[PDB]
Amino acid sequence: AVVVKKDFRIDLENELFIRGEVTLVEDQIKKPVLVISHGFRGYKDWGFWPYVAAWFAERGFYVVHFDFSRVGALNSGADEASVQKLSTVSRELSDLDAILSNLREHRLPLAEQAETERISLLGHSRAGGSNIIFAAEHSYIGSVIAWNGGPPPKAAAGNPNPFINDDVEHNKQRFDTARLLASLTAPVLIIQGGKDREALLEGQQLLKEAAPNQTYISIPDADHSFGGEHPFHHTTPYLEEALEVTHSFITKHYLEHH
Ligand SMILES: O=[N+]([O-])c1ccccc1
């Protein structure tokens, strides 16, 4: 049982691109799909992501994780205005659309082993919110999990990004995850570490109050990265628990029960 890792690159407009990887144990059968989105400071090789992708591949998934367009732009020497424009939630939604379209058109590596009837999303931090938005707007997403994220987007930390300020202001209803969670009939899981930063914990309580239909799990002693921040020598009890709970939540919802 070898975990294969197949690199790919999706060419977008002009000089932009998405680099990604498919992680899979090749069993000559279609496997449910997990698409992973990294957080605002992440990239596909950051911290626990390679371990996480392999962990789900060992447990029966066809896994996709990838660099958002803004990562390749930065690495390619794009200037600050270009990188800032690519850093909106709106661009995340568009990059996810390119990943999912290429998956659904069987252009990703080993796509004959992807069960595209059974797509789940896993998003970390800021991508937890954008994954909820994407899932709510796309019927073909069957379930979504957010790790230490979920609340509606707002202006990023550090330097002012005006494109982010405009994106947030022109999309207040569209990006309101409390309203989206309340009406989404697909199962949503939010895992939140109890040691995380305290404006985030308050945002998470508003989601649970707004949308008690969904599933909210606390890991009381875990921080924003479940201890798996870069570099990654080994897993942690908080990351293993988040993986277990995420896995259990997905399989619990594969069969339609009533
Ligand atoms: O209250 N909670 O346990 C909770 C609330 C939001 C997200 C995760 C857990």
Residue numbers in the entry: 4 to 261
What's the publication's text?
PsEst3, a psychrophilic esterase obtained from Paenibacillus sp. R4, which was isolated from the permafrost of Alaska, exhibits relatively high activity at low temperatures. Here, crystal structures of PsEst3 complexed with various ligands were generated and studied at atomic resolution, and biochemical studies were performed to analyze the structure–function relationship of PsEst3. The residues located in the active site, including the catalytic triad (Ser128, Asp199 and His227), were strictly conserved.
